[PDB]
Amino acid sequence: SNAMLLYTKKDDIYSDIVRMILLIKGANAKIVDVSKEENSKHLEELNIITPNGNIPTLSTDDFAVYRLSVIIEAIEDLYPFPPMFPVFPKQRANARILLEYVNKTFLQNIIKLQSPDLDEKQANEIKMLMQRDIISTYKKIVSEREVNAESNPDAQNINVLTLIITFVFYYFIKLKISIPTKDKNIIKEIKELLSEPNFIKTI
Amino acid sequence: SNAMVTLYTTKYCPYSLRARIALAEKKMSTDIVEAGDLEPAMIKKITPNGVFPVLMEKDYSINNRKALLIYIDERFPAPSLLPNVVNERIKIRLSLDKIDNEWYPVLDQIRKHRSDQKMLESMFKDLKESLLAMEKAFTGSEFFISSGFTLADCYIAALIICLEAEGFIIDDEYGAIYEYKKRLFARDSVKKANI
Ligand SMILES: Nc1nc2c(ncn2[C@@H]2O[C@H](COP(=O)(O)OP(=O)(O)O)[C@@H](OP(=O)(O)OP(=O)(O)O)[C@H]2O)c(=O)[nH]1
Ligand SMILES: [Mg+2]
């Protein structure tokens, strides 16, 4: 009825972001881990409705959308409460520009490192590229969040970039990558950032 | 001056025609500054990384290609350049990524591989089949996958203007698609950008 079928795979950072956002929206969605063997029938249907069996994929009776920037948008159309983006066009543009950067710098590389054919010398050069920009990235995410919250104190929306970066840190630890920072506060914030209840429920 | 926004464009660029077609549809007062017409020093001041087009306002500047037109649509709400029904809007937003990643690169490959003896000939044939095999798949709607003029039509018009200057012209052979091309070029927004 609220058919919503979400194709995912275990330990896939993309599927963890969409599942957490569906949880926050309280949306009716049926999660399908195509990795599990019993779900082989669903995977067949997945290669039918997507060009490359894209993971993850939000499937409804009407559509099948597969990019992360698209999936977050679509989810906002189907469930507007609570809002994931700010209200002002400037801030929304910056949130989008920032989502693209976090996807190409971290999300795409976290997926490269999980390849069993990736040469050791490349993997190590990938982890170092992510270590150089993670702190600077996190500072900008918080910077944009403080602005958007102050410009509309009554809007009371959620910062999807904060939700996405939480999973970056999580996968940093999962992959034994160092979060380079001796700042006591950033570690506290990251500490509380990984402690939010909706995030534990996702893992 | 007194213009609301200033759009620094670059010649023969679909990302520049996209912005112009949309800013015209919105009727936002714009000053258009062509690139190359600037001092090589100023070109680095507006866009430090030579990425065009650039859209400047009093308090804000933006040149991200994947998010520019979505900003013009949200910054100047009327007229809405996205579908009104949810299911239809969720799809157009996906076809935008499809167009940027599947159909715009083929334009660059017509410029880049104009260095191979018979590569262009093979590319015009592939693009032609890609359309004719789609002119039948799509029919019976005024504008691209919707009842009203959408961002997807700006994406496509700009791409059509740029291919048409590279020798690939849309004839009667594309029929359903050619009538869609004649309606697109009739609009004033797409017309100001084609001259
Ligand atoms: N596995 C996976 N990848 C995702 C997901 N969401 C976005 N991406 C990938 O990230 C790359 C670029 O992401 P974007 O932020 O959309 O930037 P772009 O549109 O300019 O390409 C793309 O790969 P690319 O190398 O640029 O090729 P292409 O997709 O542009 O054809 C895209 O496939 C996801 O949920 N799962
Ligand atoms: Mg791409």
Dist CA A141 CA A160 (whole Å): 10
Dist CA A149 CA A156 (whole Å): 7
Q: Which residue pairs, CB below 8 angstroms and at least 24 apart, start in A109-115?
A: A110/A13, A110/A168, A110/A171, A110/A175, A111/A12, A111/A13, A111/A14, A113/A175, A114/A11
Name residues whose C-beta falls within 8 Å of residue A161's C-beta, 6 or more positions apart in sequence.
A95, A98, A99, A102, A141, A144, A145
- Any idea of the CA torsion for B92, A98, B66, A127, to the nearest 10 degrees? -110
Count: domains in chain A: 2
Give the CA angle between residues A58, B93, B26 to the nearest 5°. Answer: 155
Q: Can you give the C-alpha Rg of chain A in angstroms? A: 17
Cβ contact, residue pair B87, A89, below 8 Å: no
Dist CA B97 CA B68 (whole Å): 13
Q: Are residues A98 and A51 in the same domain?
A: no
Dist CA B37 CA B23 (whole Å): 21
Q: Tokens 């017509």 identify what position?
A: B110
Q: Are residues A112 and A29 in the same domain?
A: no
CATH code of the domain covering residue A62: 3.40.30.10
Q: Which two tokens stand for residue A88?
A: 């002002």
> Do residues A170 and A194 lie in contact, with contact meaning Cβ atoms separated by under 8 Å?
yes
Dist CA A75 CA A58 (whole Å): 9
Cβ contact, residue pair B97, A97, below 8 Å: no
Which residues of chain B are in CATH 3.40.30.10 domains? 1-82+188-195
Give one DSSP letter per residue of B37-61, joined into a string.
SS-HHHHHHH-TT--S-EEE-SS-E
Hey, which residues does B32 pair with through a beta bridge? B7
Q: At how many degrees (to 10) do helices A68-78 and A13-25 cross? A: 10
Q: Are residues A98 and A192 in the same domain?
A: yes
Q: Are residues A36 and A106 in the same domain?
A: no
CA of B6 relative to ligand 1 center, distance in Å: 30
Which residues of A, range 36-75, sit inside 8 Å of B by Cβ?
62-63, 65-67, 69-70, 73-74
Q: Tokens 């569906």 identify what position?
A: A22
> Do residues B101 and B154 lie in contact, with contact meaning Cβ atoms separated by under 8 Å?
no
Chain A residues whose beta carbon lies within 8 Å of the beta carbon of residue B70:
93, 96
> Do residues B178 and B172 lie in contact, with contact meaning Cβ atoms separated by under 8 Å?
yes
Chain B residues whose beta carbon lies within 8 Å of the beta carbon of residue A63:
87, 90-91, 94
> Do residues A32 and A6 lie in contact, with contact meaning Cβ atoms separated by under 8 Å?
yes
Hey, which residues does A8 pair with through a beta bridge? A33
A91 → chain B, closest CA residue: B71
Q: Are residues A89 and A185 in the same domain?
A: yes
Q: Which two tokens stand for residue A77?
A: 């159309």
Q: What letters, b where the CB count within 10 A reaches 16 and e where it falls short, cover B56-79?
A: beeeeebbbbbbbbbbbbbbbeee
**Considering every ligand atom, which ligand is closest to the CA of A58?**
1
Dist CA A48 CA A37 (whole Å): 18
Give one DSSP letter per residue of chain B, joined into a string.
---SEEEEE-TT-HHHHHHHHHHHHHT--EEEEETTSS-HHHHHHH-TT--S-EEE-SS-EE--TTTHHHHHHHHS-SS--S-SSHHHHHHHHHHHHHIIIIISHHHHHHHHTTTSTTHHHHHHHHHHHHHHHHHTTS-S-SBTTBSS--HHHHHHHHHHHHHHTTT----TTS-HHHHHHHHHHHSHHHHHTT-
Exposed/middle/buried for residue A98 (C-beta within 10 Å: 0-12, 13-18, 19+): buried
Q: Which residue among B60, B67, B90 places its CB closest to the CB of A65?
A: B90
Q: Considering only CA atoms, which of A29, A10, A2 is closest in space to residue A203? A: A10
What is the position in ligand 1's atom list of the atom closest to the CA of A71? Answer: 35
Q: Considering only CA atoms, which of A33, A32, A22, A31 is closest in space to residue A78? A: A22
Dist CA A57 CA A60 (whole Å): 10
Which residues of A, range 90-109, sit inside 8 Å of B by Cβ?
90, 92-93, 96-97, 100
Q: Are residues A94 and A189 in the same domain?
A: yes
| Beta strands at B54-56 and B30-34: parallel, antiparallel or unpaired | unpaired
CATH code of the domain covering residue A133: 1.20.1050.10
Chain A residues whose beta carbon lies within 8 Å of the beta carbon of residue B60:
90
Q: Are residues A185 and A142 in the same domain?
A: yes
CA of A53 relative to ligand 1 center, distance in Å: 14
Alpha carbon separation from B75 to B19, B55, B193 (Å, rounded): 13, 12, 21
Q: Which two tokens stand for residue B101?
A: 């990643």
Domain membership of residue A73 as a residue range: 1-84+197-203
Fold that domain B1-82+188-195 belongs to in CATH: Glutaredoxin (3.40.30)
Q: Which two tokens stand for residue B21?
A: 């077609």
B77 → chain A, closest CA residue: A89
Q: Whose CA is nearest to atom 23 of ligand 1?
A: A108
Dist CA A99 CA A107 (whole Å): 10
| Beta strands at B61-62 and B5-9: parallel, antiparallel or unpaired | unpaired
CA of B62 relative to ligand 1 center, distance in Å: 21
Q: Are residues A91 and A55 in the same domain?
A: no
Q: Are residues A181 and A95 in the same domain?
A: yes
Q: Are residues A201 and A154 in the same domain?
A: no
**A65: helix, strand or coil:** strand
Q: Which residue among A63, A73, A96 places its CB closest to the CB of B87?
A: A63
Name residues whose C-beta falls within 8 Å of residue B128's C-beta, 6 or more positions apart in sequence.
B173
CA of A41 relative to ligand 2 center, distance in Å: 30
Q: Are residues A103 and A179 in the same domain?
A: yes
Q: Are residues A96 and A123 in the same domain?
A: yes
B87 → chain A, closest CA residue: A62
Q: Which amino acid is at A90?
A: K
